[PDB]
Design a binder for this molecule. Structure first.
Ligand SMILES: [Cl-]
Ligand SMILES: [Cl-]
Ligand SMILES: [Cl-]
Ligand SMILES: [Cl-]
Ligand SMILES: [Cl-]
Ligand SMILES: [Cl-]
Ligand SMILES: [Cl-]
Ligand SMILES: [N]
Ligand SMILES: [N]
Ligand SMILES: [N]
Ligand code: NA
Ligand SMILES: [Pt+2]
Ligand SMILES: [Pt+2]
Ligand SMILES: [Pt+2]
Ligand SMILES: [Pt+2]
Ligand SMILES: [Pt+2]
Length: 129
């Protein structure tokens, strides 16, 4: 599923992401934009052989199992495929664990490079919330 901007903002709010670990909804929508362009089925292979999955491009080296990332962990205890669902529950639950890991949203490189410090509120502007 390819979410609309305000559609995803509403979904992320419903699932407890607004101000989670102090990160406003705009930060999460911005991260999703530049990680996946709001496409739940987005996948991208990394040079180390791990793969990023879903709207927030969660990685298989630590967070989910895809059965082809040697030495990896599965800290969210999910198959990576669960992160590709039209329902973002799995991605949100896992993202909450990631953002609590110590480095906040810096875990998402695209967030640090393209969202951090910017007017992230613009990503939820005009949206019914
Ligand atoms: Cl957009
Ligand atoms: Cl915001
Ligand atoms: Cl594996
Ligand atoms: Cl699995
Ligand atoms: Cl959803
Ligand atoms: Cl959830
Ligand atoms: Cl933080
Ligand atoms: N939820
Ligand atoms: N949830
Ligand atoms: N949903
Ligand atoms: Na894994
Ligand atoms: Pt879909
Ligand atoms: Pt939820
Ligand atoms: Pt929660
Ligand atoms: Pt777009
Ligand atoms: Pt939902």
């Amino acid at each position: 599923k390819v979410f609309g901007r305000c559609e995803l903002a509403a979904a992320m709010k419903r699932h407890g992401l607004d101000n989670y670990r102090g990160y406003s909804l705009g930060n999460w929508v911005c991260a999703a934009k530049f990680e996946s362009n709001f496409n739940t089925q987005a996948t991208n292979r990394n040079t180390d052989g791990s793969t990023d999955y879903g709207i927030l491009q969660i990685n298989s080296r630590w967070w989910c199992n895809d059965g082809r990332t040697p030495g990896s962990r599965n800290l969210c205890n999910i198959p990576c495929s669960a992160l590709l669902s039209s329902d973002i529950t799995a991605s949100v639950n896992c993202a909450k664990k990631i953002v609590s890991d110590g480095n906040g949203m810096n875990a998402w490189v695209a967030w640090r490079n393209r969202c951090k410090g910017t007017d992230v509120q613009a990503w939820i502007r005009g949206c019914r919330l």
